[PDB]
Amino acid sequence: APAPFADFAPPVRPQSTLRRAITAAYRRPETECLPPLVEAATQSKEIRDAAASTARKLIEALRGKGVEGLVQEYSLSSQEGVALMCLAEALLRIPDTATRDALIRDKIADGNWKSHLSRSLFVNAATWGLVVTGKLTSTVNDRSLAAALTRLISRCGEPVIRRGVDMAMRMMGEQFVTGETIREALKRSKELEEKGFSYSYDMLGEAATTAADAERYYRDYESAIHAIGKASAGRGIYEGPGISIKLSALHPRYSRAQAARVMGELLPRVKALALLAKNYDIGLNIDAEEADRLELSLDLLEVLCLDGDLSGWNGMGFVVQAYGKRCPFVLDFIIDLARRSGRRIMVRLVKGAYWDAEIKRAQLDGLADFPVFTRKIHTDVSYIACAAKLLAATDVVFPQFATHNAQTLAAIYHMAGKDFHVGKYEFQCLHGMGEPLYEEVVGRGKLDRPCRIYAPVGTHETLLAYLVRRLLENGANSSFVHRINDPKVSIDELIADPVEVVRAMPVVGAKHDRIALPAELFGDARTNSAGLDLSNEETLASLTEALRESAAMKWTALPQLATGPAAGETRTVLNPGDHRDVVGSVTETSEEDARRAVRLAADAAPDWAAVPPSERAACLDRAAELMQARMPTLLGLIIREAGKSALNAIAEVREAIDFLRYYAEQTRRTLGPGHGPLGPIVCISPWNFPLAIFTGQIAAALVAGNPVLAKPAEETPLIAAEGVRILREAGIPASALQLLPGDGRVGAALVAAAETAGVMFTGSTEVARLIQAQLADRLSPAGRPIPLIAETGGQNAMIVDSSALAEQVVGDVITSAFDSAGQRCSALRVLCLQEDVADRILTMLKGALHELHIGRTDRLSVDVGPVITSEAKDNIEKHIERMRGLGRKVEQIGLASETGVGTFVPPTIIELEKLSDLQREVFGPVLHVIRYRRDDLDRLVDDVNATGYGLTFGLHTRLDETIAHVTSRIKAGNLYINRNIIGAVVGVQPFGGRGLSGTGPKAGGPLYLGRLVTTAPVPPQHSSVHTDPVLLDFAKWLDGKGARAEAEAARNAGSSSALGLDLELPGPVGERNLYTLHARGRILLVPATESGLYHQLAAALATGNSVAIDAASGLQASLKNLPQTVGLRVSWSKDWAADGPFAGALVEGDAERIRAVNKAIAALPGPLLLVQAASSGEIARNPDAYCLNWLVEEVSASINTAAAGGNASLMA
Amino acid sequence: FGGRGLSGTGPKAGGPLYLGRLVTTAPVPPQHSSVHTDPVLLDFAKWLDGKGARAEAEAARNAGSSSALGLDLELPGPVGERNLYTLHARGRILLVPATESGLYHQLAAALA
Amino acid sequence: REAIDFLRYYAEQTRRTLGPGHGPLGPIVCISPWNFPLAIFTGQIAAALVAGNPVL
């Protein structure tokens, strides 16, 4: 039996002093990074003057010397230019030239281009938009482009099509790539090699998602090395061409979490390529990628440079990124490695290509700081400082200064001085971008310094995959290439010395003013929770010890009544991934003590309600600080008790911290003396988010002034008991928060107890239906229904069309379906693939499936942990075998023998024929796949809605028409565009669904606290200037019937309604997070009086709903001669169960009438209904008798606006 | 400029639909598109699909896409003013069909 | 000013749209009110003309 966390994340090798100094700088404050870089980058006034003159001379040459001319000749708008290039791209996909010209002449030019050209013409329009406009739009307005294409063809005919085709052919065959194949690229390299340039070839491709794709990239590199080495023909590593590789192309799990696989499987592949480069004596450069791959790549560089089989060859090269805070320390490590190995490492200094992505990633992960600078000028100073370090070590490394910035170039040219020989150092540039600049550098007639051109190689399909990066770079106002073209910027501004500009700043190295540190994402509202960097060796080493120590603690959970801990039946709590690992002990609550706890809560309710809301919120904030400080220990418990990986557990604790701080702030924004608490609230929580949802419900209830009976899931009582301990330490009195461990009997006994004033339930729909039935008997002392928040299961779909990027889709599907072994309510259950791309994506998906590591979760390398119990395993497996028995194709990962000691289900893909093949939620790692024809998209959305669930939903598309269509027709609470559908963030994606998925209001949203008090407050930002027009028609109808008071109340409801609220919530860069209020659907009205009916109808119509009115009320004659607009919204129901599903209900009557109706409503099939009831007298006295908060439906939508490959907003 | 009802047939003078009325085949005006698809059009297309009216369902989907209903633009003009231009439904269209297929095509155009 | 703007606007809209498949109707009769005696007069005529129609 392995000791817990004994092998959590051991580093590849012991960290040397030089390696440790790299790690120490990972997220160093920007003000601390800059001063040493300023000093190292300082040059004499003579040199600065000479560099400025050289820079000015280069820039004057640049300014003194395609698509734009085409746009001009045919008077094209921007959209027409983009549409034309998309058409040209499509026509070039026709291989035969004569066939293409015939299609152009006879079919395209003469009329309908649409009739002749499963994939939108405009799939790559974001790229062409960058080419035409210099601006990035993350999605494509495909209806605008279609109109523009029709317009331009009808106006200009075949000549403009011919010119667009020839332009696209030149750009895609000669400008974006040096050649389509390595042979073609080598042929086209001779011209500039004869002038003194050299080449490094980049076999374009995506990062590997599968073993097969990594093997394909390997054979592509190997074949390119042969062609390059044959062409090099003994010219050597400086004069002759070389190759550049990206490590992520060569292994599908290139990450620190999979370090052992990287060293075991990726390293030999790089070695084999390096051995071939050695035999031909060409350069082989390792390109630099995301910041969390930097230090991992150093372990590969170390082993390769120490491997005697590669000795005698100085061609191994390595990129370092000057925008990274570790860059000078990385260079110290590399220079020392070069000395130790005796290999003259070729070091390519770049500024860095992932800037926007690094900012977004650090914010999402809640880390202390960025791993890159945030002011562009800091990167420039870093680059020059690092060049000074490299130029002092040319005996042991070969510096390669990759830049298109003439000021950067000039500064280094003069820094390097007058002594030069080929092999001392070189410059580098990108094909088709740097030739103008370096034609003023290479050659005895210029500066007589060599330049190596980085040459992309690949077909048109491969090039379009990630061309947005370079184009977005050259279009950013900070980019030299953009500024060199901007007439509004002078040469003086372009030759400004960044070293002296930074030195003279009032605070040297201050963070960019307009970029939020992750902790400050929400500004003054609240402090963001902090995460942990699992790529940081210091963090991993510290976490290893804290996690081990957490496994040595004697975790217990006891019935913590107001009077003290109670005795009960005690049993062990076992690790679901290894039942030999005893995590702790739980004493469960007798039904007698559960009922006693409710009585003690009722007795203590006045004392807790009298704690002012601000001080209740202070308790929540103190609990958040405690959980943040205790996160490492909490991680260890969650990992072992609940089957979570370290990443899952960090997200779990962060979410609890965010709940505490969000509900505290929402309290400070809203709660006053008139928002009286309900009374004792029973909080019943699921096993699968055993700290986050547990904490969220309890915190909300407590901060609203209610004492809480906390009933955690029987599977996960320990982390629950620890959360209660933290809340009590933070100042929640024992009488206000009682913990009652146990199974559903304890939950049921709490729900049924006389003094229970409200219930907050998260769990299965079936259990919620049992609680709904138990509460249907019950009324408050005021004679009103006991409020129930019931947040339940999902049957969550993702729709993928042929414009989506397969690698992006597969990553988001793998994460959404199999993270936490599918044991998220948000998990992806049904993937819907457009038929034209289904086979390719499915093959990639199955390949990615088999790269997952399943096992006990106290190892960083484990991706997918166990299912929670043997019963859950049996239920999931029964479903899989039923599907297999029907002949459906089933793909499963093989499980390791070690899983036998726990309860594991392998990640599984099941190919279905129809969405109706699924019956109920299968809460496990089981992804179902269905295919659809594009014309059937609307019917597919119907099919998704038809399950009756409505929790999470994903859409992958680049096409605005498809976004608008799908998002307007889908009925789900949490929408996600071009991203995964999991990990909703508190106050950013307020979380919760509709139908069988929930009553609402959403947890982590602004309507939540208002449900836990007798009179709901007005939430922040909660209003709408829009008035429902059917409500307005009804108010006029009422005035025509003489019902003057009801017409006034109807108009007031129309104004009070927040239907149409449409907000963007603050969050991370690279994402737009939207929150909107919609109609719920059809509301069941059960009136008793005419005026009651009018008030009910006004409330329902003002919030956008239709209604079904109880025909047994006998009030038909009160609604004669309705306007057709109102009649369209009104039906009469004799059999309520036949006319559903409803989305809520309004009831009028005395207490016993309300009780009877509530029993009838609870018996309706399908979704739990949020019921509001009032007496006739209450309707007359209280305009808010029916609260409009609960008659609208919240919808959250999260759009990944970086999905096109970059962040347009941050480029400015 | 131009109105509806007793005030005009349209298209508006000084607007982008105007010239297209004065030729036998109207062009696609500048900026004339919409990403929104009428939901009743979508339901009509599915109904046509179920009946096997394949040409008509295709015509309906094409009308749904090329319709500029929902266009909502800000036009360039002076500072201190916002000048908006939007395309709404006309209202109720009189349909005078002769054949079943003609009626389906008329319905597609009107619903879209 | 309005007459000038009609002229230049329909000129530009023509440059943005009209090609060989956008055939003219033929003779167009332009009947105008007294109250905008140059602006609407010019606008209707200019549009019909630039669309390729002779005007009465």
Ligand SMILES: *[C]/[C]=[C]/N1=C2[C]=C([C])C([C])=[C]C2=N([C][C]([O])[C]([O])[C]([O])[C]OP([O])(=O)OP([O])(=O)O[C][C]2O[C](N3[C]=NC4=C3N=[C]N=C4[N])[C]([O])[C]2[O])C2=C1C(=O)[N]C(=O)[N]2
């Ligand atoms: C595959 C890969 C590749 N590589 C390379 C190579 C070569 C030869 C070259 C030339 C390049 C490359 N890359 C890219 C780089 O990095 C960059 O990006 C470019 O180059 C640009 O730079 P330049 O020319 O220098 O320009 P400028 O303009 O001067 O600059 C720009 C830059 O900056 C920065 N930023 C911006 N913004 C900002 C910044 N920072 C801070 N803050 C702020 N706000 C950035 O960086 C930009 O970019 C590459 C490579 C590799 O390998 N890796 C990488 O990463 N990259």
Ligand SMILES: NC(=O)c1ccc[n+]([C@@H]2O[C@H](COP(=O)([O-])OP(=O)(O)OC[C@H]3O[C@@H](n4cnc5c(N)ncnc54)[C@H](O)[C@@H]3O)[C@@H](O)[C@H]2O)c1
């Ligand atoms: N909508 C959401 O936000 C959300 C979030 C997480 C999980 N869920 C759902 O939760 C389910 C998985 O969690 P689970 O397995 O712990 O759910 P569950 O329904 O099996 O149990 C949830 C809680 O109800 C209690 N319970 C069982 N019977 C009860 C009864 N008769 N009366 C009162 N309480 C009773 C349990 O002890 C537990 O504390 C999934 O269906 C998942 O989709 C929903």
Ligand SMILES: [Mg+2]
């Ligand atoms: Mg259960």
